[PDB]
């Protein structure tokens, strides 16, 4: 037995088996991308129009906007991957998930618990005096509107995850990256527009064009990072023989790697993101435990030692917090990594022999250059690095883009290039072979 | 007049696929079309100025079974080596 | 303890395979500018989509708080 | 036709190979054997330039 | 010689081409030349080894005569003989009439 | 897939959504 009643209960999104074109697709991953940005503009009910600063660090990982609809944004849902990625990782609960129930339970348990978090985050949110005003009955009201708002991300997510292109939660948080950086450069409280009054009124500061020079920095150092090059050819074909007719292979190739260790340091920084969350929120409505606060931000504790140091420029004054931050992040990362093997991953082995069975054929050459077995190594050399093996790697090098700092965040910046990178492709990618394929590969 | 670089253009590819790749084509031995003769000498030591092995053991063997390049045409088989030495390192890649 | 330090060894060998991956010439800036462009491309229309509602949204949040 | 090089002399002549005919199969005709060309007509000129050194030996005497 | 060239809006006189002008974006020497657009054809996209397959019957550029055709000339529709053998470091055709390379 | 019961339109959460808008946008701004 499990949670079944009330799992049942929970509304999930009806999939069609009809027709949906590339268009169709597109357009629906538009609208939702403009119901996300409109929450980011609309602000939630409260009459205290005060509210005491930010969380920095928050906003970035969560793709959310403190202060409007969508405060709580992506939060809740990692936050609940997490929990899943501990229990069934950890061999906890030793789950096999090869049966659609296993699978599906760990699914449908974890959207559950989405859900447990997304109120547990908004109570937790404006407990940790993310508004200023804690009137009990004002408080409930925010409580329902912050949370609510998260939920409508569930069902946003499920909706681009079954009418459209992306996935919702990486859509989100590129969205929210991608905004920050141009509003921030360009808006109406535009950095470039700061730097570039600053040089018309005859005081040039260095400042205002700082944090548009870490970004660029940062996106030039994070898409050098998959640049490489190498190829297999033991496909087969030979169709037309004569080397100036056409060709006779069958031609296979990567260039980019690592690609399913993305979502092990997705939960990485977010679990410092509650962290540093539910330590402010233990603090100032009960003990510390995690750290000591004071002046929004932690001052000491776990929570310190263990909290970001971006957002303009490079913290050079504290090397010991730098130095078990960044330690910390990397294990972190090899962790959530390591639950990413015992907990969703990918396959090599059979990946391998997945291809012979032919190769290409005129019809008339019958492979055997391809070896059915004998190629299971070429894939367990091949996969990882793409569940572990970059996973500190990628942690490492996020972290070291945040010491740089950036805008948008330098580790933000860092998944939403790669978001944006499979994204791209998906918006270009329908095109070509529904002409009936570009062929002869195999 | 003590050595030629002209054989220190020995190289013509490395074999490749299925069977025999495995440690044969990489690591120590490896198996590779080199010159016609061989010469068992600057096949040895132009792999010596490049991973300094003094090759575990310097082999040759012409490469043989059957013609083919339209083999359901004539076929033509020109002959070329498996180098099928084994290096005595295999490290400096 | 061994699985410390056979994980150790398959970092240098993938990185051995990093070496000669290397002189495949992972084009030289070719490759990495073709990720650079269509990156930079996508955070592009993504930020000014966000940008045409947010800045003029908070126009109108501004002159009429 | 009749329109081209500048001539080579047999001090530098000498350069010339040790880069076209020689360390140049440990890279691109090794990496011939490592394929990857969209630049086909590059190595048709690591050819037919070294080919030319031995024409303006024969044909110049070295000049 | 090479008495005519890249440089001529061609008419066409073989039917179901002629009356339709352009230029000649590259001339071809399959007795055809590439003209702009009077070249689309049918074209069952084929399936014989490697193609695409598509859903519909594609149109494709193919080229027409010179055995049978006319260019516009210096104000001239009409062709009035030709030659080459033209100044300069060109070598060009020239008409014949026109007396002038168009 | 999932085990959930209930079927919800991908229209209806998408109308449900600007339910929120509508309601939150002229429950905050637009003070009277």
Same mark, same amino acid.
């Given at each position: 037995?499990?949670?079944?009643?009330?799992?049942?209960?929970?509304?999930?999104?009806?999939?069609?088996?009809?027709?949906?074109?590339?268009?169709?697709?597109?357009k629906w991953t538009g609208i939702v991308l403009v119901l996300y940005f409109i929450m980011g503009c609309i602000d939630v009910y409260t009459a205290g129009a005060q509210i005491p600063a930010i969380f920095e660090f928050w906003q970035t990982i969560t793709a959310s906007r403190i202060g409007t609809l969508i405060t709580l944004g992506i939060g809740p849902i990692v936050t609940a991957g997490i929990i899943m990625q501990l229990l069934v990782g950890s061999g906890i609960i030793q789950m096999d998930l090869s049966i659609p129930?296993?699978?599906?339970?760990?699914?449908?348990?974890?959207?559950?618990?989405?859900?447990?978090?997304?109120?547990?985050?908004?109570?937790?949110?404006?407990?940790?005096?993310?508004?200023?005003?804690? /009137?009990?009955?004002?408080?409930?009201?925010?409580?329902?509107?912050?949370?609510?708002?998260?939920?409508? $991300?569930? %069902?946003?997510?499920?909706?681009?995850?079954?009418?459209?292109?992306?996935?919702?939660?990486?859509?989100?948080?590129?969205?929210?990256?991608?905004?920050?950086?141009?509003?921030?450069?360009?808006?109406?409280?535009?950095?470039?527009?700061?730097?570039?009054?600053?040089?018309?009124?005859?005081? @040039?500061?260095?400042?205002?064009?700082?944090?548009?020079?870490?970004?660029?920095?940062?996106?030039?150092?994070?898409?050098?990072?998959?640049?490489?090059?190498?190829?297999?050819?033991?496909?087969?074909?030979?169709?037309?023989?004569? =080397? =100036?007719?056409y060709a006779a292979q069958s031609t296979h190739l990567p260039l980019k790697?690592?690609?399913?260790?993305?979502?092990?340091?997705?939960?990485?920084?977010?679990?410092?993101?509650?962290?540093?969350?539910?330590?402010?929120?233990?603090?100032? #409505?009960?003990?510390?435990?995690?750290?000591?606060?004071?002046?929004? =931000?932690?001052?000491?504790?776990?929570?310190? %030692?263990?909290?970001? @140091?971006?957002?303009?420029?490079?913290?050079?004054?504290?090397?010991?917090?730098?130095?078990?931050?960044?330690?910390?992040?990397?294990?972190?990362?090899?962790?959530? !990594?390591?639950?990413?093997?015992? /907990?969703? !991953?990918?396959?090599?082995?059979?990946?391998?022999?997945?291809?012979?069975?032919?190769?290409?054929?005129?019809?008339?050459?019958?492979?055997?250059?391809?070896?059915?077995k004998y190629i299971e190594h070429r894939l367990k050399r091949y996969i990882p690095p793409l569940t572990v093996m970059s996973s500190a790697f990628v942690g490492f090098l996020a972290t070291i883009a945040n010491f740089i700092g950036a805008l948008g965040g330098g580790?933000?910046? $860092?998944? /939403?290039?790669?978001?944006?990178? =499979? #994204?791209?492709?998906?918006?270009?990618?329908?095109?070509?072979?529904?002409?009936? @394929?570009?062929?002869?590969?195999? | 007049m003590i050595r030629e670089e002209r054989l220190l253009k020995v190289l013509r590819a490395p074999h490749v696929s299925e069977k025999a790749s495995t440690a044969m084509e990489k690591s120590n031995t490896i198996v590779l079309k080199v010159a016609k003769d061989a010469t068992k000498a600057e096949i040895k030591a132009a792999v010596q100025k490049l991973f300094e092995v003094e090759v575990e053991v310097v082999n040759t063997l012409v490469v043989k079974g059957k013609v083919k390049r339209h083999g359901q045409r004539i076929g033509r088989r020109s002959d070329w080596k498996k180098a099928y030495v084994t290096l005595k390192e295999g490290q400096n890649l | 303890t061994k699985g410390k330090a056979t994980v150790a060894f398959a970092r240098e060998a993938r990185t051995e395979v990093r070496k000669v991956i290397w002189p495949t010439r992972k084009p030289t800036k070719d490759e990495y500018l073709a990720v650079a462009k269509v990156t930079a491309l996508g955070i592009s229309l993504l930020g000014i989509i966000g940008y045409i509602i947010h800045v003029p949204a908070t126009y109108i949040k501004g002159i009429l708080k | 036709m009749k329109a081209k090089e500048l001539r080579e002399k047999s001090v530098e002549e000498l350069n010339t190979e040790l880069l076209n005919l020689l360390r140049e199969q440990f890279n691109l005709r090794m990496?011939?054997?490592?394929?990857?060309?969209?630049?086909?007509?590059?190595?048709?000129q690591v050819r037919r330039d070294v080919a030319r050194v031995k024409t303006l030996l024969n044909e110049k005497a070295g000049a | 010689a090479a008495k005519i060239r890249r440089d001529d809006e061609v008419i066409?006189?073989?039917?179901?081409?002629?009356?339709?002008?352009?230029?000649?974006? *590259?001339?071809?020497?399959?007795?055809?030349?590439?003209?702009?657009?009077? *070249?689309?054809?049918?074209?069952?996209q084929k399936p014989v080894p490697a193609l695409n397959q598509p859903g519909g019957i594609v149109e494709k550029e193919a080229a027409?005569?010179?055995? *049978?055709?006319?260019?516009?000339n210096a104000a001239t529709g009409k062709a009035d003989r030709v030659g080459f053998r033209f100044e300069d470091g060109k070598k060009v055709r020239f008409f014949k009439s026109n007396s002038e390379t168009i | 897939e999932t085990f959930s019961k209930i079927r919800v339109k991908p229209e209806h959460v998408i109308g449900v959504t600007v339910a929120f808008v509508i309601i939150e946008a002229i429950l905050t701004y637009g003070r009277f």
């Open positions: 037995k499990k949670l079944i009643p009330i799992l049942e209960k929970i509304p999930e999104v009806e999939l069609p088996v009809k027709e949906i074109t590339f268009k169709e697709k597109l129930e296993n699978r599906a339970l760990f699914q449908g348990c974890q959207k559950l618990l989405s859900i447990i978090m997304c109120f547990v985050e908004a109570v937790l949110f404006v407990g940790a005096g993310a508004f200023g005003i804690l /009137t009990p009955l004002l408080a409930f009201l925010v409580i329902i509107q912050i949370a609510f708002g998260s939920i409508i $991300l569930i %069902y946003l997510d499920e909706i681009v995850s079954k009418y459209g292109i992306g996935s919702g939660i990486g859509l989100f948080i590129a969205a929210g990256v991608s905004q920050t950086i141009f509003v921030g450069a360009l808006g109406p409280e535009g950095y470039l527009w700061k730097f570039l009054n600053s040089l018309i009124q005859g005081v @040039p500061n260095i400042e205002y064009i700082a944090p548009i020079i870490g970004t660029i920095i940062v996106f030039l150092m994070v898409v050098y990072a998959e640049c490489m090059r190498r190829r297999i050819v033991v496909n087969y074909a030979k169709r037309q023989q004569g =080397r =100036r007719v790697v690592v690609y399913v260790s993305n979502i092990p340091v997705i939960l990485a920084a977010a679990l410092f993101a509650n962290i540093q969350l539910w330590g402010l929120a233990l603090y100032r #409505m009960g003990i510390p435990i995690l750290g000591h606060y004071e002046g929004g =931000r932690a001052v000491d504790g776990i929570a310190y %030692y263990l909290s970001t @140091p971006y957002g303009l420029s490079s913290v050079i004054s504290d090397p010991i917090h730098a130095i078990v931050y960044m330690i910390a992040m990397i294990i972190t990362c090899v962790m959530f !990594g390591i639950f990413w093997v015992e /907990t969703t !991953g990918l396959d090599p082995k059979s990946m391998a022999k997945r291809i012979k069975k032919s190769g290409a054929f005129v019809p008339g050459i019958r492979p055997g250059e391809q070896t059915a580790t933000g910046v $860092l998944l /939403t290039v790669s978001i944006v990178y =499979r #994204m791209y492709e998906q918006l270009l990618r329908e095109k070509v072979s529904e002409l009936h @394929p570009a062929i002869a590969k195999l | - | - | 990496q011939a054997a490592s394929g990857q060309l969209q630049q086909s007509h590059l190595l048709k | 066409v006189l073989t039917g179901k081409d002629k009356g339709k002008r352009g230029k000649v974006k *590259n001339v071809l020497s399959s007795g055809k030349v590439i003209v702009e657009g009077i *070249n689309l054809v049918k074209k069952h027409i005569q010179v055995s *049978n055709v006319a260019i516009f | -």
